[PDB]
Amino acid sequence: RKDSNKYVTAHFMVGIVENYTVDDWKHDMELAKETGIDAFALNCASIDSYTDKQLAYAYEAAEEVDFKVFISFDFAYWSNGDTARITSIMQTYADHPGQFQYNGAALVSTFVGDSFDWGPVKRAVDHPIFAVPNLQDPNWAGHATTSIDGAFSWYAWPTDGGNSIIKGPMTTIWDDRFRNNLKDKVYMAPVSPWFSTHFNTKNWVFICEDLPHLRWQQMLEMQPELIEIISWNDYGESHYIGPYSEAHSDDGSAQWTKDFPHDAWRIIAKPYIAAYKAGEREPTVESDQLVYWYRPTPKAVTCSKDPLGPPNGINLLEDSVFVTTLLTEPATLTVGSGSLEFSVDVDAGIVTNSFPMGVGSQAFSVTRDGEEILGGDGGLDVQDRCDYYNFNVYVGSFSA
Known about the structure:
The chain is an alpha/beta fold. The protein has helices at 22-35, 51-64, 83-93, 119-124, 138-141, 173-182, 211-222, 254-257, 265-278, and strands at 7-13, 39-44, 68-74, 101-102, 105-111, 129-131, 150-152, 186-191, 196-198, 203-205, 226-229, 289-294, 320-327, 331-337, 340-346, 349-356, 362-368, 371-377, 394-399.
């Protein structure tokens, strides 16, 4: 294999892991390694008393299991008055053997913090630093005064700049604005599968649908310098692709996430990550597999007791069951959704098809030359009633 200079990272919420041990970190890291992810962005806050402890555990774990990590300073909490502490943290970790390196320099990033100047940090740390903050305006990325080396976009979902929820499908419009402004500097593109949040302070969806697959196809077209997956473990916004960890701290998101595994989305990601790193325009399918996802009820069901209203944007969703097939040769896909039954011929490669949702049991089957290659029952029966509004999805898979 030829050496590559493209890398995939994943956003990790340090704020929810006060009780993590080194072993807990290692478990997440092994699953990320198996997906082909190169590093976790350790998103952390100045206000958490356990930040230094958990950064130390994560860097130790990464060095022990041949993984890499870098810091995402979360400027919802860190502030422009924190140069001294940010500098001291980078002095500790920029040359750590577990620190992710890009072109010989320690990668550092942010959530927000567009106005934070990296100059004083870089000039105080002997080891080179490569600063790729999260920037909100593509125009600023092209004119920033903060000594940046690239920009990371958080525009992972369909949006038009405003505060209305817009329909999909997702496009590359924002990616292409960042790339135009960045010129020779690097772009770290966001990849997210889904979005649903349901708190007193934030209650909306974005219109994602086929996004768990479609976004990876956009990455092969676009070939950004870096990718960050949003997210490994942000349960509260439903975009996690990592496991539901036993050791994280619940914020109320257990209501819509505890029984909703998302691990099978890593089956889609794995071959696309390999193709992205190799510069290939299509993935290589190693074996026959299927990944499916769907919401728990039809979108129009009224709840019996939710103290929060329905999320903003749900009228734009479809009542669909989504199926990504990963096929070595062409085959036939059959889906039963309640009383509904559908069939479609599917090409070799990785293809997503959506099917009308019916209340009841869900069934999946792929047949080739008249014989069933893979199949089984969906792990969740769709219902026609709910106690609370849950616009997260259940995800599952079958593998030959």
